[PDB]
Amino acid sequence: GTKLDDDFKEMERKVDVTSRAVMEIMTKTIEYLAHLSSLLQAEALLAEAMLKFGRELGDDCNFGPALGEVGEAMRELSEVKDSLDIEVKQNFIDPLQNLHDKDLREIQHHLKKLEGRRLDFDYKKKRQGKIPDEELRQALEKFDESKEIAESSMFNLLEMDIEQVSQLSALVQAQLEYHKQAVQILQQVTVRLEERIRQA
Amino acid sequence: GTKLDDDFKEMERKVDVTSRAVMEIMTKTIEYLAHLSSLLQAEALLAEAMLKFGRELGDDCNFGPALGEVGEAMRELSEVKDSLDIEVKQNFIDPLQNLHDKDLREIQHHLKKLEGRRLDFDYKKKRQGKIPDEELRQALEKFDESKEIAESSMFNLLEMDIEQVSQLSALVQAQLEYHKQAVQILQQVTVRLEERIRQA
């Protein structure tokens, strides 16, 4: 039947990939944040157990207040991990989700409508003499018209891809913010333990 | 029956706590490393999925090579997390495990032997005239002797607690090493994305 130019085709492939990537990347980033939460929880637990025994054991010794120093340090890291979840979630996931329920969905729609209009024209073309020229003409009009709409929505999404890179950036952003935030917490308690071991 | 001085008692309590702490702390640190591995895995997956779609999508655009830049960055972080597991495991867990199968176990043993010898003396004391003085004397000798052995092993463990603090330090060590190691990886790719978004 009717065939679409290669440009249109390549443009479609890219949109496809993009759409599928945004799909998996998003699901796996969610699975990722699941385990992050899981670890974050376990962290806080270990942290408490420390703050706890460091209590019971008493502070007249060394291991007692140390379990307390490392204790809170561990728990603060824990809370920073939670902040990270929230960051990734609303600055990377949500945007991609919105891209999928808005732009990608709409493209998919136009593409379906284009296919329908294409098939319908190929059919009405088969019966050229049988059907009134006006009807055929419209069939062709509708096809061209749908092709144009699909080309625009696809093109606009593909041309705005620098924003996907901003989103990837957003992820790496919150990522770096957490690790830097943590290097502080740790580096701090890493000096307090340096003391004790020195007041040895 | 026979009672042990308060110093001996307090010394016993501390040893108890310490022993129990080293127990939970260790189990929870293991549960912690479990989830760390779990997240680490999920990270690498997301990382691959990126390196993948960034491939398929192609590099003639922006999102393609970006998914590749953030792609490996994510995977390298993943591998650093694995290094961290190994660190915590052999520089914090293993030491504590050895403390539990060596020093703590031995104390527990001495303590049991002390109890036996105590109970046995209280019994042989009940039957003072009934049993030969020599036997009673030995019973007392054995008790004092076991008490001394228990006091030494407990005291030595409690006096060497600065080493627990070194271990806590070891944990916080590997912890800080990972986060600093990561701040690099990220900070790096955080500048490469700065470029693309600038060559916009």
**What DSSP letter does each residue of chain A carry, written as one string?**
-----HHHHHHHHHHHHHHHHHHHHHHHHHHHHHHHHHHHHHHHHHHHHHHHHHHHT-SSSSHHHHHHHHHHHHHHHHHHHHHHHHHHIIIIIHHHHHHIIIIIHHHHHHHHHHHHHHHHHHHHHHTTTTS-HHHHHHHHHHHHHHHHHHHHHHHHHHHTTHHHHHHHHHHHHHHHHHHHHHHHHHHHHHHHHHHHTT--
Q: Position of tokens 């030491």? A: B95
- Going by the DSSP 8-state scheme, the letter that residue B103 receives in this structure is I
Residue with tokens 């127990």: B23
Name every residue whose Cβ is closer than 8 Å to that of residue A4 and which is 6 or more positions away in sequence: A12, A118, A147
Alpha helical stretches, state H, A57-91: 63-88
Closest CA to A77 of A175, A193, A181, A198: A181
Residue type for position A124: K
Q: How far apart are CA B158 and CA A182, in angstroms?
A: 32
In this structure, are residues A103 and A32 in contact, taking their beta carbons and an 8 Å threshold?
no
CB B111 within 8 A of CB B150: yes
Amino acid identity for residue B95 in this structure = P
Q: Which residue of B has its CA nearest to A66?
A: B165
> Are the beta carbons of A168 and B200 separated by less than 8 Å?
no
d(C-alpha B178, C-alpha B55), whole Å: 29
CA distance A33 to A168: 15
Please classify residue B100 by burial: count the beta carbons closer than 10 Å to its beta carbon, then call 0-12 exposed, 13-18 middle and 19+ buried: middle
Chain centroid to CA B66: 40
Angle at A94 between CA A92 and CA A95, to 5 degrees: 65
Nearest CA in chain A to B169: A193
Give yes or no for a contact between A189 and B157, defined as CB atoms under 8 angstroms apart.
no
Nearest to B179 by CA among A29, A129, A80: A80
Separation of alpha carbons B86 and B92, rounded Å? 10
Cα–Cα distance measured from residue B149 to residue B163, given in angstroms and rounded to the nearest whole number: 22
- Are B80 and B178 within 8 A, CB to CB? yes
Distance CA B35, CA B53 (A): 27
Q: State whether B38 and A36 contact (CB < 8 Å).
A: no
Cβ contact, residue pair B42, A28, below 8 Å? yes
Query: Could you give the C-alpha distances from A44 to A52, A81, B86, in angstroms and in order?
Result: 12, 10, 21
Q: Are B23 and B100 in contact (CB under 8 A)?
A: yes
| Interatomic CA distance for residues B50 and B37, integer angstroms | 20
Question: Which residues does chain A have within 8 Å of residue B168's beta carbon, measured at their own beta carbons?
Answer: 63, 66-67, 69-70, 193
Report phi then psi at B79, rounded to 5: -65, -30
In whole angstroms, give the CA distance from residue A8 to residue A151. Answer: 7
Listed residue (B32, B157, B182) closest to A181, CA to CA: B182
Give which of A176, A168, A94 is closest to B196, Cα–Cα: A168
Terminal Cα distance for chain A, rounded = 86
Q: How far is A115 from chain B (nearest CA, A)?
A: 23
Cβ pair B25:A46 closer than 8 A: yes
Cβ-based neighbour number of residue B12 at 10 Å: 17
**Number of domain units in chain A:** 1
- List own/partner pairs for B188-191 with CB under 8 A and 24 or more apart: B188/B73, B189/A172, B189/B69, B189/B70, B189/B73, B190/A169, B190/A172, B190/A173, B190/A176
Neighbouring C-beta atoms of residue A74, cutoff 10 Å: 28
For B3, residues 6+ apart whose C-beta sits below 8 A from its C-beta are: none
Find the CB nearest A28 among B34, B46, B197. Answer: B46
C-alpha span between A4 and A151 (Å, rounded): 11
CATH of the domain at B161: 1.20.1270.60
Q: Counting every residue, how long is chain B?
A: 200
Question: How far apart, in Å, do the first and last CA atoms of chain B sit?
Answer: 86
Exposed / middle / buried, residue B7 (Cβ in 10 Å: 0-12, 13-18, 19+): exposed
The amino acid sitting at A195 is E
Of the candidates A52, A84, A165, A175, the residue with the CA atom closest to the CA atom of residue B200? A165
* Mutation choice for A interface testing from B32, B84, B192 by most A CBs within 10 A: B32
Residue among A35, A37, A65, A95 at smallest CA distance from A195:
A65
Contact assessment for residue B114 and residue B3, using Cβ atoms and an 8 Å cutoff: no
The DSSP annotation for B47-91 comes to: HHHHHHHHHHT-SSSSHHHHHHHHHHHHHHHHHHHHHHHHHHIII
Tracing tokens 């990537």 back to the chain, one arrives at: A21
Angstrom distance (rounded) from CA A114 to CA A146 = 5
Q: In whole angstroms, give the CA distance from residue B17 to residue B158.
A: 11
Q: What letter would DSSP give residue A92? A: I
Count CA atoms closer than 13 A to A23's CA, side-chain side: 10
* Torsion on CA atoms B126, B131, B135, B136, rounded to nearest 10: 30
Q: Which of B95, B102, B101 lies closest to B171 in space, CA to CA?
A: B95
Contact A39 B32 (CB under 8 A): yes
* Cα B36 to Cα B83: distance, rounded to the nearest angstrom: 11
Q: Which amino acid is at B138?
A: Q
Closest by Cβ to B35, choosing from A28, A35, A187: A35
On chain B, the residues whose CB falls within 8 A of the CB of A158 are 61
Resolution of this deposited model, Å: 2.9
Beta carbons of A183 and B180 less than 8 Å apart = yes
Name which of B147, B146, B145, B153 is nearest B103 in CA terms.
Answer: B153
Residue A33's domain spans which residues? Answer: 1-200
How far apart CA A157 and CA B125 sit, in angstroms, is 94
Backbone angles phi, psi at B58, to 5 degrees: 95, 165
Q: In the PDB record, what is the listed experimental method? A: X-ray
